[PDB]
């Protein structure tokens, strides 16, 4: 099918952690950017308008651009950048399946490293693995890092000389993340993305993960893990069988990443919360103001298209 989307690039501020507000260049004014969910073989058209003060592009990571290399989104290689206030149209066929993503390719150390210019691109295979057909919940986890010294000033950041002192999944640091709520018998697909500049050792308590896909393509030899290392650019898809009711934390195991501004706890932490488990008065997330779409799991059920999410939206000046 032909699927055409209109996207903008916006200057907004997001709250990453308690007391860390961050200036970002959010696709449609949000970080992570909108989910794009299409089927293998679709013809995708994305019309991009740059409503920011700086040039950008969009590169479609994992899209082969078969005969469409001029839509690869690389400044000085496949296009000139999209200048401030201008527009540009990308066209490609989604012939590469799986968990893909998209991100700016201008000034990437800063724009991708700390300005939130990235989002997920999910291409459904026409022939999914049998296990993918058992899945009852699909979960996107995009990990990145943040340098508080440059929170308030575009044009700086993302170098070896900066200090990454805050860490997130889907642009929030615990306790501002949200739980992953399941019930016994769920079959959970988790898609990990190395969206920023860090390495993240994602560990699920209470469960092993079956690693089924690397960079969106299915492994001939899937393997179990309780800790999956995710580095910049990579994606891993795993399956968790939710057959062990409890409250089981699920987090980056890199010790300095479970901090926020030098304080603990913080960072890319969630909890696999099973519906049937009674809640204790001392539970950190008792009475959480819950967002069921923090991992895009509701949008992923709503058919093909492009989906914004207000839990990811920042504030305009």
């Amino acid at each position: 099918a032909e699927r055409e989307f209109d996207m903008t690039i916006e200057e907004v501020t997001i709250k990453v952690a308690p007391g860390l507000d961050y200036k970002v260049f959010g696709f449609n004014g949000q970080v992570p950017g909108p989910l794009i969910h299409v089927q293998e073989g679709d013809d995708v058209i994305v019309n991009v308008t740059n409503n920011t003060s700086l040039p950008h592009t969009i590169h479609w990571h994992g899209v082969h651009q078969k005969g469409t290399w001029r839509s690869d989104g690389v400044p000085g290689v496949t296009q000139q950048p999209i200048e401030a206030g201008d527009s540009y149209t990308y066209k490609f066929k989604a012939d590469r399946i799986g968990t893909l993503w998209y991100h700016c390719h201008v000034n990437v150390n800063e724009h991708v490293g700390v300005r939130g210019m990235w989002g997920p691109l999910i291409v459904d295979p026409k022939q999914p693995l049998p296990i993918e057909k058992r899945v009852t919940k699909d979960v996107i986890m995009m990990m990145s890092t943040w340098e508080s010294a440059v929170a308030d000033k575009y044009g700086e950041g993302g170098t070896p000389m900066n200090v990454a002192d805050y860490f997130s999944v889907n642009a929030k640091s615990f306790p501002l993340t949200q739980p992953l709520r399941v019930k016994k018998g769920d079959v959970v697909k988790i898609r990990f993305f190395g969206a920023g500049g860090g390495i993240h050792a994602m560990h699920s308590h209470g469960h092993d993960m079956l690693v089924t896909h690397k960079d969106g393509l299915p492994l001939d030899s899937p393997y179990y893990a309780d800790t999956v290392l995710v580095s910049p650019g990579e994606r891993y898809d795993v399956i968790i069988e939710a057959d062990n009711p409890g409250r089981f934390i699920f987090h980056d195991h890199v010790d300095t990443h479970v901090t926020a501004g030098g304080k603990h706890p913080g960072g890319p932490i969630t909890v696999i919360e099973y519906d049937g488990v009674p809640v204790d008065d001392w539970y950190v997330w008792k009475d959480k103001d819950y967002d069921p779409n923090f991992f895009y799991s509701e949008s992923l059920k709503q058919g093909y298209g492009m989906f914004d999410h207000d839990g990811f939206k920042g504030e305009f000046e």
Copy 2:
């Protein structure tokens, strides 16, 4: 079987490197903590007494906690912390096989990153791989990193603003590590653990490693490597066929990790020493005061239980 162990948490000082003594919270007053070795299906009970000034827990990494999530050891999620002076009992069924480990889950960046709050938990499958059948020596290597500026002071460390400037296997930096002594024909299983917050590229000279297990679970497609990357939380099990007599160094290949306080050599370095190879006058470890249990290889032959090691104990 039901296996019941009593553990304490102690404030002790260990010698990590020449030039670096470090204040740690040692399980049974040692770093690495005691080896816990049990069989698949056993009912484990661990009674923990906190003889320190700060709260702690123990999380059993890789243990599913099937029917027992209140023993997972996560403060504010599965329990309230074990306060100073207090005790607490963990109970779980060891239904998950392989190389597991345990560690504090309070203030983890500091307590696991630099205060030594970790140890190995080995669960033997009731049905081991065929390769495991041939093994003649089992070896534990737990890698971690240290920040000298906070060596003397609990309550600081383990953040991106600190500097990790010493590196170890089993809480020693070369030359205070120990050789891995083998004889021709040994079949050596090595279990690597990313115990601290660093990444470690473990490279064996003279030999390839057959990577057989990830996080304790056997791979359907094992693969050879001469360098195995180990990151925080992970375990890898390998097999080395000791069929090449010599002295072969075995170390983290991350360049800055073979330093100690800015000087080289240091860090996670051992030597695979084969019995019978003549020792040269200039060999760095000629006359080493040898510890045959530095990798827990003697304790791993002693059956199921909880095993302390005097060479890992710290001082009060």
Copy 3:
């Protein structure tokens, strides 16, 4: 067959990036060091002369040194170092196949980390994989990092306290790297090496890579990837089918590594340029002074032995 050659160690200066000249200890005065290309089973003899002011060795990473451990190149373990002005001969049998490498094993954090003391050692298997027999272009990519503060300062660098601020493939930072020029229907073998102290996430636009070998040994279960993580000491071999004409960048995806002294772009970046794609006036490499051997692809076709490359030579 017996393969004998002579290597020196030289104090030279190379250009890593615009504005950054770097003092190195180059094998045969070049960085990367000379390519050594042999066949499985060859007997290798390397006569080394140290024409520098400091001691060095050469370790042959991946070479088992079966019955020849005294040629492993480890100071204080298998030999005394090669002092300034002295010479030393290595002898070993190349019975381990695939993508190997060699590097100094003295003061490794500095000498390997920032002084360029490394090069590639390719051992052709008697029985290549079927896909290897289809290869039309063989490509070596050795990644490393540089600390500009110690560019002029032998005896310094390579510690946690230093800052790696420049990044390269084959000792150049973009734009001083070279394009990977292909034609439609090429079958490209790329060998990635973690030569320095960094981690590199190598991502090919426009193409998936088939990962076929880890540390030179063929995987029983190869797998596709668009991003391959390469850490110190490791090698990965991949295949790209060049069936998608365009200009497709190919680079380290670690965000801080596509910088040079804090400026962007820089770092380990190339472009897969297909023959016959029209060139826009804004293409960054439209006027490139092209070196077809920047990835050793021409040397790899010229027989068994040791190959220097003038584009990698430094100045005395």
